[PDB]
Amino acid sequence: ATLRELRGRIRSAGSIKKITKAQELIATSRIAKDRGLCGAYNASASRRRAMKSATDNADDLIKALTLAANRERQAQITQEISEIVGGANALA
Amino acid sequence: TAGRVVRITGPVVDVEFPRGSVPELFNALHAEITFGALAKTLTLEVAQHLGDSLVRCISMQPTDGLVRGVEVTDTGASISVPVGDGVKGHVFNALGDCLDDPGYGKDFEHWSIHRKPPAFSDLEPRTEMLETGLKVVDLLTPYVRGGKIALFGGAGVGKTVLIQEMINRIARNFGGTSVFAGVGERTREGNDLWVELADANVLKDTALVFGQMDEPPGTRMRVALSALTMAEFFRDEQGQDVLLFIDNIFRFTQAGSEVSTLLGRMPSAVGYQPTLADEMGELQERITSTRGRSITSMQAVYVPADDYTDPAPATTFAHLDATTELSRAVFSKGIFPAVDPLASSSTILDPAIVGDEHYRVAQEVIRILQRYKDLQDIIAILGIDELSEEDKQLVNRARRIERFLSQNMMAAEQFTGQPGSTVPLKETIEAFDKLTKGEFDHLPEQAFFLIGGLDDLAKKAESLGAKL
Amino acid sequence: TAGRVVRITGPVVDVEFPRGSVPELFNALHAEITFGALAKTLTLEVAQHLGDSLVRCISMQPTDGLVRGVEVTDTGASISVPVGDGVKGHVFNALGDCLDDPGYGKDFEHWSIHRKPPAFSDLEPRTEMLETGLKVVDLLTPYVRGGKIALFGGAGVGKTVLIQEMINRIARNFGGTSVFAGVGERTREGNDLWVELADANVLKDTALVFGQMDEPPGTRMRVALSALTMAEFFRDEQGQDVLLFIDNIFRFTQAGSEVSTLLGRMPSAVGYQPTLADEMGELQERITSTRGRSITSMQAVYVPADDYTDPAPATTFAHLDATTELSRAVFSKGIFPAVDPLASSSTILDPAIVGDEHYRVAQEVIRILQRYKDLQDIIAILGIDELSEEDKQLVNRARRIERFLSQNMMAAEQFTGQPGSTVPLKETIEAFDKLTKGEFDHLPEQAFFLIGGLDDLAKKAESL
Amino acid sequence: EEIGTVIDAGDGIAHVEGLPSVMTQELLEFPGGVLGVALNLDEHSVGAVILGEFEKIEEGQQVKRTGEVLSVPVGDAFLGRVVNPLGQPIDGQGDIAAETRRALELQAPSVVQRQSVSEPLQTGIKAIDAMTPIGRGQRQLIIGDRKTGKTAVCVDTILNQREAWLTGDPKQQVRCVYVAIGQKGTTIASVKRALEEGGAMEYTTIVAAPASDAAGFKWLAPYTGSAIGQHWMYNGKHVLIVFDDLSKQADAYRAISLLLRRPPGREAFPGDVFYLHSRLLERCAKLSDELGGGSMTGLPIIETKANDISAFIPTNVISITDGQCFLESDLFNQGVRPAINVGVSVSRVGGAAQIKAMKEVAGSLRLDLSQYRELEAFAAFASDLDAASKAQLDRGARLVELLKQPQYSPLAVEEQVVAIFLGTQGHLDSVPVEDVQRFESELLEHVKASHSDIFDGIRETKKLSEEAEEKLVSVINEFKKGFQASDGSSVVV
Ligand SMILES: Nc1ncnc2c1ncn2[C@@H]1O[C@H](COP(=O)(O)OP(=O)(O)OP(=O)(O)O)[C@@H](O)[C@H]1O
């Protein structure tokens, strides 16, 4: 279930990255021209910077998750082979 | 001419016979365990010819107490079970012994449990809808009369409750014969079902065959065949419509895998026997309607660890006409029956069979739920207010739709205190047509949870303040 | 002296020989299938000595029709392929049989396909650049003479045209020759490559060696070695520079894995053969520069699951000196060759090898193209009008640079009647330094398309 | 003349002592009509895969050798029939008169006996024919999860060949072979029924290895279908062969290899499974005119799990074939049917497998759809969006609607050309997205009824001429005047 979970996380992170990127570009448009995606502004330009940061973080997260997923993929192949060959060796 | 036990390792026994007396494959042999506490007669099924007059057999009973060198007798035929109308109303084990009345059926005609499937020229595709009164099944996963229905799902998602619900909904008024195969499941459940059928007066029309999970692997491999032999007799000889319920057909494959390495077979992927698909195919191709002779079969299929890519359920999928897939994720939300509407399927969910209205409403429901699943991650991280207004409308509709696919089922009263309900197909189609159009968006989503039709919806909404 | 077949298990054949006649490891043995429909001569490669004068071999052909006990003849040598000038312009299989003209090459000198890399003393201690005359390659991702280049490219990005271009350029600029190794070659695509090279008239300069997909794993494992043996003959005996194409090197690794499985070896991590690195090293270390002549290899690499940490691509990339990614995006703009200037890379694009000015110009070009790539999404959605004046100037300059990386290719003459250009490296560096400085901003964009150096740009500018 | 003896038997395998002259892959006759194939030959015995009724095998039974490798009957009498992998009818319609016999393992056409794939094989599916065209002699993989519509795509392709069949012209006719491996019998029966309703059994043969068949039959079925098709291919005919599914064949071969104790690799597959599929699929070829110019187009089907295309068998077959149509359940549930992922699906043959008119109309489809996918996140707004990007978004939505298609409804190439013309020339811009499909169909019917010479021109010349183009535009504008939207708005201009 580790690989299934990692794939689900990768899908979620991809959707988030797409949304944040669209928000960043729309905030760029609205700069030339309530909500909480403005970063530390409460604590358009600020939303643009916050969405840039968020989409970059989503990209970093996708890369890390993909690395972990590929490690799990390789480990699963190796383990499955180990079980198959262990059984075959037992019978041989 | 009798054989002698040579090797014993768990449920696998090697038997040596005199030259020229080696039993045929699948023949039943008899050996005696004379130890007092466990004294019994073992039935061994010949699995392989090892050469040099040795045969490898699978025991149907526990081999504790069995001794090397004991005599082994070849019955000359395979395992055979009583057939005929007499079996209706009684409980049997994999070998054909009556449990509720020992000795009953010993004089019936006996059929070998090993049989070839019907000839291909006798097969006719079945496309008649079998209405159940369950909203989700009728709308999205319509069952087929004389077709092959399965309920897939991980451990404890509601396969058995759904099987009992379909026994209540289909078998109660069925004009034909019912066969139930308990395959490697809980003995408590078997007793519960026996008592429930007696209570509903459905037992007199039902033959029950049980090989439960405490039985050795041989019994779990052959009990499905025994029940199927009874059903095949009813289909082929008596010429009546048959209802076949199997719970759980995965246990047949699992029992095969438990002994595969002891039979000397190199393991396949994921630890399964190399002959997974072939043995499954023999068994499943026997489970079928033929031209003019109907078997409506419903099988519960366990999905190990909720992994629908596991080889056992993946191989099973190709054998069904309709598949209700139960999801742990849906279960954990409290949605019952925990059907995954996006993953379930039916070969008759097509405009030609169900009609344009049914098909269009079903496709719209599926589209909305798919879009909602696409949006869930965004809603979780960024919140719902960041969605478009149209997507917010879709999310509200989807939450109401997914709740309205849940239903209070009769067989679930014991788990909720609430009596079940039945929704006619026409009401289901009209209600979900209205839901997809947004006609109930003014009601709280909680009004749609565990109810029947639109009258129940109006009542529940009133009880929560709103009005339909 | 002859052996006899004892066991047949798919492509694995066990052969018994008399006590003093056991063949050497990797020796080629011959056996006859006489059944009329499948009558043929099997070649078996000795893989193991099992004891009791029994050897285990891999059949280079399917063993359907083989009978136990048939005679097996030891050739006394490993698989040997024809070598010499006679192999140019012909198609061979891994065993050295000519496919376009059966019987051709039997009389040539034959070389064993199993050979050592050059001795340590004979290897060059300084890496050298291979100047192809193509601007994008020479400037951004310079090729190493005797090095290895990974080629990445999908369908319809000019990969075949780039290969034809490299065949042309090695043949003319360097007086060299080319060997194409189709490892796991699709037969349709092998026929297409043969016909296309004949039509482009570069077939006479190339030797094709196909180990096709529908063959047992042994030939797919050995075809790369056969092609490399022809290339080694050209380098070492004819004193030529050789371009060795290998499509696809991953299929070589996978054929090795399959052979390892058939021979009953326990798989290593991710199911690859335990000797993965050793096999790759034995192949790749023979692709080197030695005695003043080189074999330079361009190798198509498939990356399983797009996972560059997968053992096969990781082992391959341990030997690669540069990468050329052909991009659908660049192709769709009419820019040829469709090299992705940002994705592609080279291990010798550093000052210590190409010199400080080359490195400076290349880094500036890359910085400009990366800025343009970043600005592209804003340009596309919001629109160009939303960019600052500096952003617009950068975009115009980057469009001119990115278009000037195209070039009229020698292989392209067959499509467009104009001949191709070879641009000296100094001229390329000067030109792109100027383009970075903006000295050609006033010129129209369409004037930077498919030309050579500054003279071509001037002539085209006046023409527009 | 030699006779072997069964020494042991289990799980569809039987070992035989003797038979010193048996060939590798020879057919063996066991008592009672039972057949086996000699696979493992060693100094002790022959490991034989039993091809059915394995339960009758007993230690000590005498075994005869036929002196023949596996072979099947071949000829025109197989059209319209259902046969098992041995070529024996299973439909109950009587004997099949064979023209000759073909050994299953006859070598594929060599690299010098072929010619470049150049003729279209029209599937009738706009998504495929426009985005991943298939030529004659090509191998196009149909790959995807269960219930993504793979069988539907292949059945529609077979159905689309009926008009070609009715021409009577062997250089236009396509004879079809459908190989069913590991399916349940009723499923094969429903495929046959769908073909019968479309009048396709006139030119289609089915090779059936249902799930109840021995692993040997599932292993052999693709090669039987291939041999039947090869007989036609070498006689100048054009053949389309569908394998449904090759993953089932690989599973059966793995079962056999494990039962014969051959060393396993990744996913327990033997070291020659890639070879199984590659030697199967390289027999699909376009032959040189010296050999009659026949062809066999391959449509292998692969079922992925959780859309894992990096799994072993999918990786093998993807590498083997000349292009892949990827089907996706997410797209299916979204209503994109056929559920082809246009972004990642590819045809390495490409425009060489399209007529000129299709090349012209479909040229911008890939770029338009990629741009639309890029802008999909911005639909929520469609505001503060550059007019060019908003237009790209609207056009892409209409094109996606244009590539949808109902089941069992293949389109002639001329109708596809006109529909793609509607989409790509801007004629759907004024139409509501929800009406696009209806518009298309209605328009096509109109053209079929009143201006059928546009279709005739495209069909005869393979080009949409300028005069035909302006006639079509006029017809479209008049039809728009006549069309009634779903929202009641006007689709005029
Ligand atoms: N173009 C289409 N439009 C609508 N429904 C379709 C279309 N193509 C297929 N379907 C439906 O989708 C479902 C899956 O079709 P099909 O059985 O051909 O797919 P598959 O991927 O081959 O499935 P399986 O896993 O059963 O082999 C069936 O209900 C079929 O009717």
Ligand SMILES: Nc1ncnc2c1ncn2[C@@H]1O[C@H](COP(=O)(O)OP(=O)(O)O)[C@@H](O)[C@H]1O
């Ligand atoms: N329709 C339902 N309504 C309420 N609870 C249910 C329903 N179905 C299942 N459950 C709960 O989930 C449990 C699992 O059901 P069961 O069918 O036994 O699982 P399995 O899938 O293992 O057969 C039940 O014992 C019950 O408590």
Ligand SMILES: Nc1ncnc2c1ncn2[C@@H]1O[C@H](COP(=O)(O)OP(=O)(O)O)[C@@H](O)[C@H]1O
């Ligand atoms: N430098 C170029 N000049 C002109 N046309 C080119 C060039 N490179 C590629 N093409 C065109 O692009 C098409 C695909 O290129 P090619 O490499 O032959 O195909 P593939 O990469 O699929 O093998 C060719 O038909 C060719 O006409």
Ligand SMILES: [Mg+2]
């Ligand atoms: Mg249960």
Ligand SMILES: [Mg+2]
């Ligand atoms: Mg299918």
